[PDB]
């Protein structure tokens, strides 16, 4: 039995105050750098063990021994995401039922049907940037977020948020973002039921209602029209779980739609933003990727197969996910009393948290140049050990949206590289904001048109 290190405690709240910050995952990364591959983290009546090495994480990823846990963060998100795929326990009825129903709508094959509407939004992004005046700049995460949110709105339920036409976010977005903020902020309140938090809770309900109203109404409208628009909502309304013969109920469909909108807004937009960041900081790599984009994307309207041919753009995206996996942590629990790593006994139910950024900096796997941006790491997928690279989570609880995210990102980054040269005009200093996910706050660039019509 080896004793685990533990960071400083701060009274009855034990370790909690270390995460009472705007950048808690970055704090945990620093603790991991200080204490090593495993450390214990205490809160009142809770002990969590944070894992950073491939040696220990590969064992945590054994689904016969460990299952997905709902961290307190996910439990608060569950207040509006309900028993949607992302905030359900594996054993809960609606997890397997929605998983079976939805899996085919997220396959690589399904991406052929989403491709046109992904291109519709991508073209809007390119046209926006073509239309800026010489003295103007691009706010990168802002525009990536407009793109990824609008794309899931169109593929999820055939709705146009029209984010490239508006001053203030569509009112659903404003409410979803404020709800996610409250959910994370709740984690840091020592006395939740203190009167100063009353306007928070009133605002929380107003927001949740703005969400359910767009969504319950969108579901009832579709049920009433019978319109067979070929999208995720159609598939959820018509699909039946082969294991049980039952379809999802309207309440669960609402939760799935809210969940996809959260993911659309929070995740892929972060990846695109980090990718563009690393490219402007590594101009030779940018030129290599732009050369591939010019060679491959020879139609003003890119096709599905052309996106599949963007091999080096895919490597750039994987290397951006290596350094800054945008959904950087996931939680597991021991299915039974067991011993981790031959050294750390666990009780049934004990929580393990995987720090993906730390996993992805394990020098025993990646070599000494781990901190550097080198897409060529990914030239041979066979060279990457099992469980060394995990930006989409693990096993049956991995990201159902992986193919969707990578198709969208590869298409968009390819079109960006086809149509513009990029200038890091401010010499931007990386500043990572944490919501549900990681994104580069304040990242701005200038884009000079290559004058290729589309
Ligand atoms: C680059 C973009 C994305 C990344 C890095 C990412 C990452 C992840 C990770 C790490 C998990 C596992 C979470 C856990 O174990 O607690 C996950 C789950 C999930 N993601 Fe994503 N995601 C991305 C994009 C998307 C998109 C675009 C969608 C859908 C529109 C999506 C929908 C989901 C859902 C429903 C789950 C839960 C799957 C299940 O447990 O059945 N994600 N994602
Ligand atoms: Zn600005
Ligand atoms: Zn937003
Ligand atoms: Zn279909
Ligand atoms: Zn026991
Ligand atoms: Zn070096």
Question: Any bridge partners for residue 251, and if so which?
Answer: none
| Approach to solving | X-ray
Euclidean distance between the first and the last CA atom of the chain, given in angstroms as a whole number: 64
Please tell me the distance between residue 361's alpha carbon and the centre of ligand 6 in angstroms.
14
Q: What are phi and psi of 58, to 5 degrees?
A: -60, -35
- What letters, b where the CB count within 10 A reaches 16 and e where it falls short, cover 126-144? beebbeeeeeeebebbbbb
| Neighbouring C-alpha atoms within 13 Å toward the C-beta of 271 | 32
Q: In the numeric block, which tokens belong to residue 395?
A: 């096993």
Q: What are phi and psi of 440, to 5 degrees?
A: -75, 95
Of 330, 401, 409, best ligand 1 pocket probe by most atoms within 8 Å of the beta carbon = 401
The single residue listed with the structure tokens 């709705």 is: 159
What SS3 state is found at 47?
strand
50 is in an annotated binding site: yes
Cα dihedral across residues 134, 135, 140, 146: positive or negative: negative
Residue 155 is among the residues annotated as catalytic for this protein: no
Tally of CB atoms within 10 A around 77: 23
Closest-CA residue to 353 (of 317, 386, 374, 329): 329
Per DSSP bridges, beta strands 46-51 and 351-355 are parallel
Q: At what angle do helices 311-323 and 268-281 cross, to 10 degrees?
A: 100
Question: Any bridge partners for residue 420, and if so which?
Answer: 449
| Active-site residue (options: 161, 260, 399, 410) | 399
Q: What are phi and psi of 322, to 5 degrees?
A: -65, -55
Q: What residue ranges in 85-235 does DSSP mark as E strands?
A: 138-139
Please tell me the distance between residue 30's alpha carbon and the centre of ligand 6 in angstroms.
21
Cα separation, 3 vs 344, in Å, equals 8
Please tell me the distance between residue 169's alpha carbon and the centre of ligand 3 in angstroms.
6
Tally of CB atoms within 10 A around 396: 13
Residue 267 is among the residues annotated as catalytic for this protein: yes
Domains and CATH numbers, the chain: 1-454 (1.10.630.10)
- Of ligand 1's listed atoms, the one at least distance from the Cα of 390 is 10
Closest-CA residue to 180 (of 141, 151, 152, 211): 211
Residue 326 is among the residues annotated as catalytic for this protein: no
197 is in an annotated binding site: no
Q: In the numeric block, which tokens belong to residue 44?
A: 């009142």
- What letters, b where the CB count within 10 A reaches 16 and e where it falls short, cover 1-36? eeebeebeeeeeebbbebbeeeebbebbbebbeebe
Whose Cα sits closest to atom 20 in ligand 1?
A: 399
- Of ligand 1's listed atoms, the one at least distance from the Cα of 326 is 5
The single residue listed with the structure tokens 């049934």 is: 348
Ligand nearest to the CA of 442: 2
| Active-site residue (options: 86, 378, 392, 443) | 392
Question: Any bridge partners for residue 141, and if so which?
Answer: none
Tally of CB atoms within 10 A around 283: 12
Distances (CA, A) of 272 to 140, 422, 438, 446: 9, 14, 11, 16
DSSP-assigned states of every residue in 340-351:
ETTTEEE-TT-E
- Of ligand 1's listed atoms, the one at least distance from the Cα of 84 is 35
- In this structure, the residues whose C-beta lies within 6 A of any atom of ligand 1 are 68, 85-86, 99, 152, 259-260, 263-264, 267-268, 271, 325-327, 330, 391-393, 397, 399-401, 404-405
Please tell me the distance between residue 31's alpha carbon and the centre of ligand 6 in angstroms.
24
Q: In the numeric block, which tokens belong to residue 300?
A: 């003003």
Please tell me the distance between residue 230's alpha carbon and the centre of ligand 4 in angstroms.
5
Cβ proximity of 353 and 331 under 8 Å: yes
Q: In the numeric block, which tokens belong to residue 201?
A: 């809770």
């Amino acid at each position: 039995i080896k004793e685990m290190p533990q960071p400083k405690t701060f009274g009855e709240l034990k370790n909690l105050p270390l995460l009472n910050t705007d950048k808690p995952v970055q704090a945990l990364m620093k603790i991991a750098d200080e204490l090593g591959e495993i450390f214990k983290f205490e809160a009142p009546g809770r002990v969590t063990r944070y894992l950073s090495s491939q040696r220990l994480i590969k064992e945590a990823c054994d689904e016969s021994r460990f299952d997905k846990n709902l961290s307190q963060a996910l439990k608060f998100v569950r207040d509006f995401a309900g028993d949607g795929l992302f905030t359900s326990w594996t054993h809960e009825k609606n997890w397997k039922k929605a998983h079976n129903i939805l899996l085919p709508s997220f396959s690589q094959q399904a991406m052929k049907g989403y491709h046109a509407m992904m291109v519709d939004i991508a073209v809007q992004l390119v046209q926006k940037w073509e239309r800026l005046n010489a003295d103007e700049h691009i706010e990168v995460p802002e525009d990536m977020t407009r793109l990824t949110l609008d794309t899931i709105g169109l593929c999820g339920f055939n709705y146009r948020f029209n984010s490239f036409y508006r001053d203030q976010p569509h009112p659903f977005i404003t409410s979803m973002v404020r709800a996610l903020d409250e959910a994370m902020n709740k984690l840091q309140r020592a006395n939740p039921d203190d009167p100063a938090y009353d306007e928070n809770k009133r605002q929380f309900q107003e927001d949740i209602k703005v969400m359910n109203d767009l969504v319950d109404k969108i579901i009832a409208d579709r049920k009433a029209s019978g319109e067979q628009s070929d999208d995720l909502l159609t598939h959820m309304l018509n699909g039946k779980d082969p294991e049980t013969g039952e379809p999802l109920d309207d309440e669960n469909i609402r939760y799935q739609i809210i969940t996809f909108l959260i993911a659309g807004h929070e995740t892929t937009s972060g990846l695109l933003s980090f990718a563009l960041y690393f490219l402007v900081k590594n101009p030779h790599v940018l030129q290599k990727a732009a050369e591939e984009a010019a060679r491959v994307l020879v139609d003003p309207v890119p096709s599905y197969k052309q996106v599949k041919q963007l091999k080096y753009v895919g490597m750039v995206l994987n290397e951006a996910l290596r350094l800054w996996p945008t959904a950087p942590a996931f939680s597991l629990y021991a299915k039974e009393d067991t011993v981790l790593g031959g050294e750390y006994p666990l009780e049934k139910g004990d929580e393990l948290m995987v720090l993906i950024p730390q996993l992805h900096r394990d020098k025993t796997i990646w070599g000494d140049d781990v901190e550097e941006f080198r897409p060529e790491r990914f030239e041979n997928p066979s060279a990457i050990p099992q469980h060394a690279f995990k930006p989409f989570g693990n096993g049956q609880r991995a990201c159902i949206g992986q193919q969707f995210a990578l198709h969208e990102a590869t298409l968009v980054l390819g079109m960006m590289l086809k149509h513009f040269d990029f200038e890091d005009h401010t010499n931007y200093e990386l500043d990572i904001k944490e919501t549900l996910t990681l994104k580069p706050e304040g990242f701005v660039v200038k884009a000079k048109s290559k004058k290729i019509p589309l």
